[PDB]
Design an enzyme around this catalytic site. Structure first.
Site, PDB file in Angstrom:
ATOM      1  N   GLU A  30       0.858  -1.173   0.000  1.00 56.45           N
ATOM      2  CA  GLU A  30       0.000   0.000   0.000  1.00 56.45           C
ATOM      3  C   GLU A  30       0.901   1.231   0.000  1.00 56.45           C
ATOM      4  O   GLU A  30       1.835   1.316   0.788  1.00 56.45           O
ATOM      5  CB  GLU A  30      -0.930   0.001   1.225  1.00 56.45           C
ATOM      6  CG  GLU A  30      -1.970   1.102   1.153  1.00 56.45           C
ATOM      7  CD  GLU A  30      -2.903   1.186   2.347  1.00 56.45           C
ATOM      8  OE1 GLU A  30      -2.410   1.025   3.497  1.00 56.45           O
ATOM      9  OE2 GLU A  30      -4.133   1.402   2.137  1.00 56.45           O
ATOM     10  N   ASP A  90      -5.455  10.041   8.545  1.00 52.66           N
ATOM     11  CA  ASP A  90      -4.138   9.587   8.976  1.00 52.66           C
ATOM     12  C   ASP A  90      -3.779  10.095  10.370  1.00 52.66           C
ATOM     13  O   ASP A  90      -4.123  11.211  10.758  1.00 52.66           O
ATOM     14  CB  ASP A  90      -3.056   9.904   7.941  1.00 52.66           C
ATOM     15  CG  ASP A  90      -3.131   8.952   6.755  1.00 52.66           C
ATOM     16  OD1 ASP A  90      -2.970   7.734   6.981  1.00 52.66           O
ATOM     17  OD2 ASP A  90      -3.349   9.430   5.621  1.00 52.66           O
ATOM     18  N   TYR A 124     -10.769  -3.571   3.271  1.00 52.96           N
ATOM     19  CA  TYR A 124      -9.850  -3.054   4.283  1.00 52.96           C
ATOM     20  C   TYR A 124     -10.586  -3.030   5.623  1.00 52.96           C
ATOM     21  O   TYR A 124     -11.497  -2.226   5.820  1.00 52.96           O
ATOM     22  CB  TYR A 124      -9.361  -1.654   3.889  1.00 52.96           C
ATOM     23  CG  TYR A 124      -8.165  -1.116   4.654  1.00 52.96           C
ATOM     24  CD1 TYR A 124      -8.196  -0.988   6.035  1.00 52.96           C
ATOM     25  CD2 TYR A 124      -7.050  -0.649   3.986  1.00 52.96           C
ATOM     26  CE1 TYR A 124      -7.110  -0.497   6.747  1.00 52.96           C
ATOM     27  CE2 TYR A 124      -5.952  -0.154   4.681  1.00 52.96           C
ATOM     28  CZ  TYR A 124      -5.987  -0.071   6.064  1.00 52.96           C
ATOM     29  OH  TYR A 124      -4.914   0.457   6.745  1.00 52.96           O
TER      30      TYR A 124
END
Ligand SMILES: *Cc1c(COP(=O)(O)O)cnc(C)c1O
Ligand SMILES: *Cc1c(COP(=O)(O)O)cnc(C)c1O
Ligand SMILES: [Cl-]
Ligand SMILES: [Cl-]
Ligand SMILES: [Cl-]
Ligand SMILES: [Cl-]
Ligand SMILES: [Cl-]
Ligand SMILES: [Cl-]
Ligand SMILES: [Cl-]
Ligand SMILES: [Cl-]
Ligand SMILES: [Cl-]
Ligand SMILES: [Cl-]
Ligand SMILES: [Cl-]
Ligand SMILES: [Cl-]
Ligand SMILES: [Cl-]
Ligand SMILES: [Cl-]
Ligand SMILES: [Cs+]
Ligand SMILES: [Cs+]
Ligand SMILES: [Cs+]
Ligand SMILES: [Cs+]
Ligand SMILES: [Cs+]
Ligand SMILES: [Cs+]
Lengths: 396, 256, 396, 256
Positions: free
Chosen positions: D49, D60, D175
């Protein structure tokens, strides 16, 4: 000869040089006439509503009284244009100047709030404004000086005497004695020679009138007490006036106790000074034993007027109003408390009134009492002052 | 007040005006002030006006504001001024001595007591600068009980009622601050006022003669004497010389 | 699935990580419910009136328009508690937090006004408040930081990205994604992911509703145009909303032109940026050619949001609202003009709106037009900024 | 997406999980990043990734926020990242390469054009971190037209409707960010979702084995690889050693 009584009991009068008596007589006549003139009253009401923002809120403060039997309202003069109650009466006096055919305004200022209020009123109404300010005050009130200049006022530093407020008070009177045919002296509190204590009360009395109507609407009865800080006496007499004849309503004025009455470093002449004659009036004064006029000390520059309005001295003497003091540390606590618990930053002047109300509550928490504090102004102006003390105490 | 009555009678017999200088007591210090005052007398002052330093001299312009500050810098108090007044009287038996006071200094320890101390030290008149005729009653009553003349200002903006009040209530002299000039003076005489002394802008000999020509009893130099003090602080000797010169000239201008 | 359309035409949407979608859905449902709940509306009206001081004045400004055919009114959000319009919607959103059973508030701030507004609302309503602020903003907004701390808020400097407002925007969202069961994210403008643009408009629309009633009372007709500065879009959409369906009323939004559009140093994305996707929405952005988000520049920190609310982009696209820009120098002139001629010190943000109204007047002085400017805030906060420029220009 | 289909088939035949490290392209510079990536592959990464530096990485945490800043300090642009991606593919024919993108970088020059460039350089999947399934239509449509798998996050706060949406719309892998864990994995299988990779908190070998034991196809180390970069900036040689060590251990934990 005057149209109105220049005294409140033994206090007050017209202790000015002879040359100034026609100016006072002219102003008294114009005031008496204005008070009967519906057009004047309508113009005044228009400026108060649509320019200054009246009526001001009456806020019930719940967090600060939780768990006691005190109900506390704040009359929100902090929300008035200009951020303090001074705006009400400068608009009235500017209209009086116009009524008398004057095109110019003279004003005195200490902390600068009255200078700013005079300058804003003058700008709105197209009057040329000049402001006297003690040179020492000029140096420590740079933000207020700049506001006055932004509004087109001329600011004149005064270097005589102690170079502070009482000295600007003198210098304003000296200018007016030469210029009174074209200029009005816009005095900044409910003190000085008649007819100023009367005029300033009547041009501030909307505070108490609104408070009365608002409390009747919200609680269905009058307050147990209304509480106001006392520098020269304008916001306090404005709150008190409409309630004077409601003899069940306590009238509590709070003078600055500074570092503590016993230190002598305070601004509480009504209760701890001595009657004297100065600034055109017989009233309690900060003075030396041999009669020289002294300064008031307070954390709050706005409460530094070294005298008090004659009507307060009179109301105290007859027992209609009670006067107390609050120290710098008490006022500072009240300031922090209101910020944290109600999200309102109060002027440090107003914080003296709030501090006394908090003491009434805390001392007797199971006493049922309905109190109104006059929140005479907002405290943005005071945050550097407060910051500096908190850092120095190591509260950081 | 009798000293003024005697002075004016004596001047009238000589067809002469009075010249009266003002100074602040204790400016620039007690000792120099005493010397200044004796110099003014020796040079020909007919009467004195003397100010007691006060924190807030409302009626006063810059020159006198600064004299007050000098006296305060020298630590001068009202009690010290009264000691000075007693010494001045002890040196000079006939000259009229008038004080220029602010109300708080008169009221501070009792109005009656103030005028009693004035009488004790030999003062002849008191002008209270921030007391208009309308407020004057306790001040004039105390003055007269202590044989002190109450002095009133007749301002530029006087009216007939004021002229009659000043004429009735005043003694010693009427303090004229420039209705036309000749008219005020004539009207004050008609109303049997105390003799008029012109006090506005008396800074040169020609103004003294003009005052007398207008019908006034004389002239008061409200600030010119103090200006000479201010200008000469660094040389007391020169200060006294220039004061003597000035007062001599001004007095000459009053003489027939 | 949502209850309301998340888009205004092509603009808007919900561009958040999946984890945040339940938080947005919860908030939308609570809002839709609140809007039908008379008790909620009554509580909101109570805070607006008795705490914040609504309604705000509509002031006719005569001196500034004298000799032209412009009549200019200012809607006085500067008189609201807190000194800017932000207070209206933070009170609404605090009540929404309570409705959802939350006890904590998260907010972002740039210039610090929204941080202060969030902190005051939280203090009043007993909510624990934490505020994200770009580290660079913290350094240059010490007065606002101290006000937030005085009101009991925790202020958290953000060091990621450019350490400014967009970076605090990100960090507020990151906290909320973990804490949304107990904390409400109090977004500070009419932008971001649905349902925020809708919520903030509806919690500001009292500005326009009052303006409409006040102008009808005073002039007997609607305004020719209402004019508002556009940072993120809240005060402008609050003024505009009630007039959207009055198609004769011009809606003029003013973005900051900074040093001049042609310099690239501006904050005018709606007219001079490029549509992109950031902060949860599709909208015009300040961005580089390759798609990195850039900063807005303006003399006024309050107009630095680098994006604009989606409803503005939509109203522009269909031609209902017109958007213009005003440069720092134009805003500065308008600031000085209002101070000197009306005695009101306007926020430099609001000064952009006033500057455009003054241009409408001056360019065509014999055009009869009735204009309202939204005076979104007061300018005490800006006097040092203005001082510094004036000295540097040698205006002293 | 075919590369994922092939990978999972191969791993399934070996009863083996996938281990997938994340790194930011161009962190701490282009050359070192290329070396980092080849090291991860040699050490046993099954797939990659790769993040493109973006000004505002909403999804993030601090570790990756700081990686973005390093890449920007090195002047890394999206165009440079695409050049890197083409070189990575040219070196390694079968490893699946997934990008972690933010929406503005995909939309900036046209969504379709973005996925066309992905296909040109040999990318297999794209996860757009700020596009929820509700907004995904133009992104997933463009991905599939260009043979790119659209990757969706199944968050801790997923519900049944979301599981069915992710299962229908996703390709390549799902995911998973940690309903109980075993239940999500079972339900995704029931709905014929792309194979699940666990992406929450994969920082140690035991977490890789736990993911496989739970029924997932493998695990993604979202930030642990970047932490090793951050810790070792001063010694590129040591950085590569520690990366090799870490990835070797993590991959071993996936093996039957
Ligand atoms: C000026 C001022 C005061 C004191 O003046 P008063 O004449 O005694 O009212 C008190 N509060 C505020 C906020 C002021 O500005
Ligand atoms: C915050 C602020 C603005 C800009 O924000 P909007 O959301 O565009 O209204 C404008 N004026 C003032 C006074 C503000 O405080
Ligand atoms: Cl003041
Ligand atoms: Cl300044
Ligand atoms: Cl200026
Ligand atoms: Cl009611
Ligand atoms: Cl007393
Ligand atoms: Cl003669
Ligand atoms: Cl001669
Ligand atoms: Cl803000
Ligand atoms: Cl500070
Ligand atoms: Cl604090
Ligand atoms: Cl009407
Ligand atoms: Cl655009
Ligand atoms: Cl297994
Ligand atoms: Cl193993
Ligand atoms: Cs209570
Ligand atoms: Cs006082
Ligand atoms: Cs007489
Ligand atoms: Cs006009
Ligand atoms: Cs904008
Ligand atoms: Cs699938």
């Amino acid at each position: 000869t005057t149209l109105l009584n220049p005294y409140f009991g033994e206090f007050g009068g017209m202790y000015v040089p002879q040359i100034l008596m026609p100016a006072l007589n002219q102003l008294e006549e114009a005031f008496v006439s204005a008070q009967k003139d519906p057009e004047f009253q309508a113009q005044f009401a228009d400026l108060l509503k649509n320019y200054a923002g009246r009526p001001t809120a009456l806020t019930k403060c719940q967090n600060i009284t939780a768990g006691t039997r005190t109900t506390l309202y704040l009359k929100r003069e902090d929300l008035l244009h200009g951020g303090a109650h001074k705006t009400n009466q400068v608009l009235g006096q500017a209209l009086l100047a116009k009524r008398m055919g004057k095109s110019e305004i003279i004003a005195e200022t200490g902390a600068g709030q009255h200078g700013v209020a005079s300058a804003l009123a003058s700008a709105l109404l197209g009057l040329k404004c000049r402001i006297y300010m003690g040179a020492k005050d000029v140096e420590r009130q740079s933000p207020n000086v700049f506001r006055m200049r932004l509004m087109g006022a001329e600011v004149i530093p005064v270097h005589s005497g102690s170079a502070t407020l009482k000295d600007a008070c003198n210098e304003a009177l000296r200018d007016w004695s030469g210029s009174y045919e074209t200029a009005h002296y816009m005095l900044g509190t409910a003190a000085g020679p008649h007819p100023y204590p009367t005029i300033v009360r009547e041009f501030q009395r909307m505070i108490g009138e609104e408070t009365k109507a608002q409390i009747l609407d919200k609680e269905g009865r009058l307050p147990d007490a209304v509480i106001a800080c006392v520098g020269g006496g304008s916001n306090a007499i404005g709150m008190f006036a409409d309630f004077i004849n409601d003899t069940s309503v306590g009238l509590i004025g709070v003078e600055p106790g500074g570092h503590g009455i016993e230190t002598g470093e305070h601004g509480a002449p009504l209760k701890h000074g001595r009657v004297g004659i100065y600034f055109g009036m017989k009233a309690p004064m900060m003075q030396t034993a041999d009669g020289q006029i002294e300064e008031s000390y307070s954390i709050s520059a706005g409460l530094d007027f070294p005298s008090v309005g004659p009507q307060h001295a009179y109301l105290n003497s007859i027992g209609r109003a009670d006067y107390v003091s609050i120290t710098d540390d008490e006022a500072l606590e009240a300031f922090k408390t209101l910020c944290r618990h109600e999200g309102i930053i109060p002027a440090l002047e107003s914080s003296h009134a709030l501090a006394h109300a908090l003491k009434m509550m805390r001392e007797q928490p199971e006493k049922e009492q309905l109190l109104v504090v006059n929140l005479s102004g907002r405290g943005d102006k005071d945050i550097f002052t407060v910051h500096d003390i908190l850092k120095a105490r190591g509260e950081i | 007040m009798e000293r003024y009555e005697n002075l004016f009678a004596q001047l009238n017999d000589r067809r002469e005006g009075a010249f009266v200088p003002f100074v602040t007591l204790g400016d620039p210090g007690i000792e120099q002030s005493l010397k200044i005052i004796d110099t003014l007398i020796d040079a020909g002052a007919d009467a004195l006006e003397l100010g007691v330093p006060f924190s807030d001299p409302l009626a006063d312009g810059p020159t006198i504001q600064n004299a007050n500050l000098r006296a305060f810098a020298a630590g001068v108090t009202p009690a010290q001024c009264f000691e000075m007044l007693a010494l001045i009287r002890e040196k000079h038996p006939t000259i009229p001595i008038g004080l220029l006071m602010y109300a708080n200094l008169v009221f501070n320890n009792g109005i009656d007591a103030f005028y009693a101390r004035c009488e004790q030290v030999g003062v002849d008149s008191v002008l209270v600068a921030d007391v208009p005729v309308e407020e004057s009653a306790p001040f004039r009553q105390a003055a007269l009980r202590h044989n002190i003349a109450p002095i009133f200002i007749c301002p530029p903006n006087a009216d007939d009622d004021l002229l009659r009040q000043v004429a009735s209530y005043g003694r010693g002299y009427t303090y004229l601050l420039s209705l036309p000039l000749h008219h005020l003076i004539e009207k004050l005489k008609e109303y049997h006022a105390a003799p008029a002394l012109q006090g506005f802008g008396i800074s040169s000999p020609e103004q003294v003669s003009a005052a007398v020509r207008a019908g006034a009893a004389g002239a008061i130099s409200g600030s010119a004497i103090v200006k000479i003090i201010e200008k000469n602080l660094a040389s007391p000797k020169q200060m006294l010389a220039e004061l003597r010169s000035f007062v001599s000239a001004m007095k000459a201008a009053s003489r027939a």
